[PDB]
Each structure stands twice: as structure tokens, then as C-alpha cells.
């Protein structure tokens, strides 16, 4: 029950500044009149954010697919209740568990279920002449839903001469999906007003899935007919160190990104804001290794295994030959790669990781048996041959390598 809207017009993404907004309370602890250094995921100051606007040239209605990466800072400037909902998921299909956060009318429904999404999912509000409030009418986000878990319903994320700039931060740490937000009336028509504020923690849902790609649900005006307006900014969080000055009221009033520029790194080092005249020592300029070279001693005499596997004659099993091999480099790679051998059964250490394995002696025992007698190779194996003949000790066993030689 999904609709494919192939009419979307695709263009290279626009860009804008982020200034200094994007700071959120790192932990649910009250701090007062203190400078605190934290190391968490943040939006770097004065970074490039990808402003997505339902503009025009062919009305540019915009609802692209944006990778989730390692958390997302979203910010919408709205007046007409358009940008409503979000979708999170690594493949955005019915094969991988997915997240749907719908801020529908009178409610917010957060679901983690196996959804079969639309190729172009969204929601659709249709006006009714009877009711001034628009009726949430079209709900076309998944074609089917099954295996629902953690169906969470709470009070809806509150809706605030002013545009209600709403800022959200979405994080997913160790199976906890943290949602941060703050609403502020603003004047600036399209972008963040010069100023600073911090987002409250609200809720931290226990959602135990992986997210790498995501989508924005939007409202479309049907006068199919489409419209939108307003605008949604997206920025990508990175590991950073931030210095935050908690005031007397416990509200974060300012923060400093410790890697923005040398001045900010200085302030981050002195744990203060006003720096006196003069030189300071901040960090260490250490060049990085361009590459790594691993060198191993020149190939020397090999262990002569080409004279025992390809030997013309093989001794009788009652007088099995056991040759000592030592003082040579053991290149088992070629013999393991050769497919002429019937099997390759090494115990304890897998053949893929014996290259780094080093040994103090090896005894190569060579004989001929039957295929049904291979099952007689066991620690303290039972049977006439295994008892009155060559017996494998009950201790740990080495490796067995066999091939059929009927011809």
C-alpha cells in the first residue's frame, strides 16, 4: 500500500554555516558555575551543514536519503507543521530491523519493527472544511509491519512574529538511542540566529539496533499534489572535546570546541576563557608515519618437504618413518594451497594462523593406510592397529595431512 513518487527532482545538496549551535548536556548531572571538559560526540563549531529546503527551480520539493553515520544533528525552522517524523535504519527495508519515530497528531509513536517501507515514504495531511485543524489522513510509510518490539508511546514532542526553531540531536550508543531537543522562537527567516543554547536530554530509549542511513518524513500539501516549505538542516557529529561553562542556574551558557582553532585549543588547555598576553604550550606537533614497512629476514634453506611428499618409496606402516625437521623455515603455505591432498586436519591451531606459530622440532611421520583407517587417528585410539601398532598418544595431537594415491 505504498506509492512510488518518481517525480522527485534530484540536484546536488546545498550547504550553509552551522555557527556554534549544537551543544547538548553530556550527562544527567547538575553542575553549577564551573568549567567542565568532556569528550563525547558533538557538532564542531562553525562547520558546514547541509541545509535541505523545498525550494524551486519545477518546485524543488526535497526529501532525500541521508546516511545516519555516527549520529545526526537535525534542526528545522518551521511555521506550518510540515517536517513530521523520522526513519532510521541501515538498509531501510524489511530485511533489517528499522526505526520509525512518528510525531503524529496528539501523539508520538516510536516503533522498532520489521517494516516494508515505501520507495518514497512520508505522511500526508489533508485539510477538511469542517475542521480548521488538518486531519492526519495519509499514513504511507510502510507497506507492511511485523515483529514489532519496544512500541513506545509518550507525550508528543512539544510544539512551540516568531518561527519555532526546533533542534534535535539523535545518537545511538551501545544500544541506547538518545534524543535531545530544544525549541526557540526565532526571527531570522531561514537560518540559525546568532546566539547559543543547549538541548535537554528528554529521553534515552533502549533501542538495541544499528543505524547507518536515515530519512525525514515530511508533510505534503494536497490542494498527486505536493508542497512543503520551511527547511531542515543536517550535520554530522564527530568525536571532540568540549569545554562548557555551567552557570549558577545549571544552564550551559557557552562551550568551546577544543579542536576548532589554536585559540580554542588554548582555552581548552588552560580550562579558562580569558587568556593573558603571552606564549602558552598547548599540544605536541608529531608527524605521522606515512606508511609501515614490515621486513623479515631473507629466505634461507627450506625444510625439505618436497622430498618426503614426493618421495618415490614409502616405508611400511609397521616401520613408519619419523623424520626430524629443524633449523629451517617452514613454509606450509604452499603445501596447504596445493589441492592434491585429500584432507588437511590440524588440531588446536588452525592452518590459517600457523604462519606466526614457531616450533622447536617437528617429526614428520609418513606412511600409507586405508581411508577407513583415518578414523583410527585419535588420542589413545582403540583398535587392533591402534593398540598393537603405532598408537597416537592420549595427549594433544598435531596435524594430519592425507591424499589418495590409488593410481
Amino acid at each position, epitope marked *: 500500500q505504498c506509492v512510488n513518487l518518481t517525480t522527485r527532482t534530484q540536484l546536488p545538496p546545498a550547504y550553509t554555516n552551522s555557527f556554534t549551535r549544537g551543544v547538548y548536556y553530556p550527562d544527567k548531572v547538575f553542575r553549577s558555575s564551573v568549567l567542565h571538559s568532556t569528550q563525547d560526540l558533538f557538532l564542531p563549531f562553525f562547520s558546514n551543514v547541509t541545509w535541505f529546503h523545498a525550494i524551486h527551480v519545477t518546485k524543488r520539493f526535497d526529501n532525500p536519503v541521508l546516511p545516519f553515520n555516527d549520529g545526526v544533528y537535525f534542526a528545522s525552522t518551521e511555521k506550518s507543521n510540515i517536517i513530521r517524523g523520522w526513519i532510521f535504519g541501515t538498509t531501510l527495508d524489511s530485511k533489517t530491523q528499522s526505526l520509525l519515530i512518528v510525531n503524529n497528531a496528539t501523539n508520538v509513536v516510536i516503533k522498532v519493527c520489521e517494516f516494508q517501507f515505501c520507495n518514497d515514504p512520508f505522511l500526508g495531511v489533508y485539510y477538511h472544511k469542517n475542521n480548521k485543524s488538518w486531519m492526519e489522513s495519509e499514513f504511507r510509510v510502510y507497506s507492511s509491519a511485523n515483529n514489532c518490539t519496544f512500541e513506545y508511546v509518550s507525550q508528543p514532542f512539544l510544539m512551540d512574529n516568531f518561527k519555532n526553531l526546533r533542534e534535535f540531536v539523535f545518537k545511538n550508543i551501545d544500544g541506547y538511542f538518545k534524543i535531545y531537543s530544544k525549541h526557540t522562537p526565532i526571527n*531570522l*527567516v531561514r537560518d540559525l540566529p546568532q546566539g547559543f543554547s543547549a538541548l535537554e536530554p528528554l529521553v534515552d530509549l533502549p533501542i538495541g539496533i544499528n543505524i547507518t542511513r536515515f530519512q525525514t518524513l515530511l508533510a505534503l500539501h494536497r490542494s498527486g499534489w505536493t508542497a*512543503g516549505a520551511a527547511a531542515y538542516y543536517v550535520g554530522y557529529l564527530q568525536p571532540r572535546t568540549f569545554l562548557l561553562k555551567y552557570n549558577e542556574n545549571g544552564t550551559i551558557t557557552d562551550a568551546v570546541d577544543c579542536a576548532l582553532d589554536p585559540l580554542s585549543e588554548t582555552k581548552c588547555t588552560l580550562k579558562s576563557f580569558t587568556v593573558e598576553k603571552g606564549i602558552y604550550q598547548t599540544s605536541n606537533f608529531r608527524v605521522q608515519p606515512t606508511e609501515s614497512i614490515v621486513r623479515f629476514p631473507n629466505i634461507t634453506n627450506l625444510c625439505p618437504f618436497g622430498e618426503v611428499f614426493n618421495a618415490t618409496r614409502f616405508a611400511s606402516v609397521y616401520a613408519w618413518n619419523r623424520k626430524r625437521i629443524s633449523n629451517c623455515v617452514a613454509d606450509y603455505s604452499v603445501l596447504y594451497n596445493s589441492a592434491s591432498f585429500s584432507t588437511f586436519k590440524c588440531y588446536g591451531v588452525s592452518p590459517t594462523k600457523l604462519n606466526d606459530l614457531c616450533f622447536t622440532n617437528v617429526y614428520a611421520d609418513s606412511f600409507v593406510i586405508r581411508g577407513d583407517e583415518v578414523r583410527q587417528i585419535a588420542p589413545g585410539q582403540t583398535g587392533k592397529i591402534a593398540d598393537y601398532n603405532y598408537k597416537l598418544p592420549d595427549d594433544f595431537t598435531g596435524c594430519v595431512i592425507a591424499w589418495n594415491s590409488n593410481n
Partner: antibody
Amino acid sequence: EVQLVESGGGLVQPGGSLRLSCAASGFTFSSYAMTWVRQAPGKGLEWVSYISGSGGGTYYADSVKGRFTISRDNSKNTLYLQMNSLRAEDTAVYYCARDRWASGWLAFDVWGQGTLVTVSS
Amino acid sequence: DIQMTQSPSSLSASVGDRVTITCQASQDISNYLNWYQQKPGKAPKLLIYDASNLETGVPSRFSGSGSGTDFTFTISSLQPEDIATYYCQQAYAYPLTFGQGTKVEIKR
């Protein structure tokens, strides 16, 4: 040919109620917005209202709070403006404007011909 | 809101002369400003949006410049028919911000 002609402007007594009409053709009144502005004879411009695909997400000026109410229309797809509690100093020629995108500031387009309204006994 | 000090209120300059209409504001609007043309008894017309981009249907002889707190809006070669009322308008804290207007006339 883009055209936005205005009608309904004229004589209303103080406190009267009226629906001004701004009839639209040659485009899409939805994906494009509309905006009432007014020119007083001998005076400057002053904006009144927005509209954005619907008349619920709009705005009004500090000087116009409570008097005017914008509205649209389906099918024939025209614009309406409801007036109440007019005052004598508000006589002006009103204009129903437009835009083209809205997401990234709001730049007008059609700038229609304008219609005169005067309120007196 | 923001106050717009648009000057001069009136100006007379001969044919071909350059005309610059300075449109003032309050704080760092940068280039986000547009200019509109109003003929007497006629509906307003688009001239330039974002102070730098020329749209369709506008003669190339119309030019505009300035950013931040000052704006030029400079006319290259004055034609006898350019006489109209010009308004400078913007968008930032809602276009409540309008200008008192400038009346241009031509010496002949």
C-alpha cells in the same frame, strides 16, 4: 499569462465584515503562496498576511492583529480575505501578492493590480 | 523589526546620468536584499533578488549592489521612461520592514 485580479474592495461601515476575493489563473495557488499588502493613497507599503499551502500557518502584522483573516479556496482555487473591526485610518489600496519557493526567505512575484477599500459612515 | 532609512526621498538627474539609491538598515543583512519597481498607477515589478541575481523579464540596464549595512542600487544609463517610485525591501525578521520610498525624476 500570469494574472491575479482583485475584487470585492469598496464600501464597508466600521466593524463590518467582508470577503475580499483574489482570483487566480495561469499557475498553482498552493505550491506558490500569496501575501496581502496594502498601499494607502499617498503613503507607503505595509504587509498583512502570508499563506503557505494552507491558511493555518500564516502571520499578521502588529498593526493588523485581529482585523484581517486570510483564506484560500479549493477547486477554482482563489484567495479570500476576511475583515473585521476596521478603523478610519486604515483606508488603502490592498494587494494580493505571491512568491515562488518560500523555503529560503519569501520573495514576491505576481504583484497584482491592487484594490481600494475605504471605511466610513 | 528593522528600520529602513532609504535616501534620497527625491532626486532629479539628467538623461544618461547614474542614479544611486542608498537603502539603509540596522545590522548585517549582507546581500539578502531585493529591489522592487512601482510605476505610478501600476502594480509593483521585480528588479533584483539577493542584490546580485537578475531575473527574467527585467532589462539588463537595471543593476544593484551593496551588502552588509549599505546598498547602492545603481542605474547605468538613465532612460526617459524610468521615472517611477522605487522601494527597497528585505526579509530577516519578517518583511514588516519596509522603506519610505524614493521618487526619481529626469532632467530633459
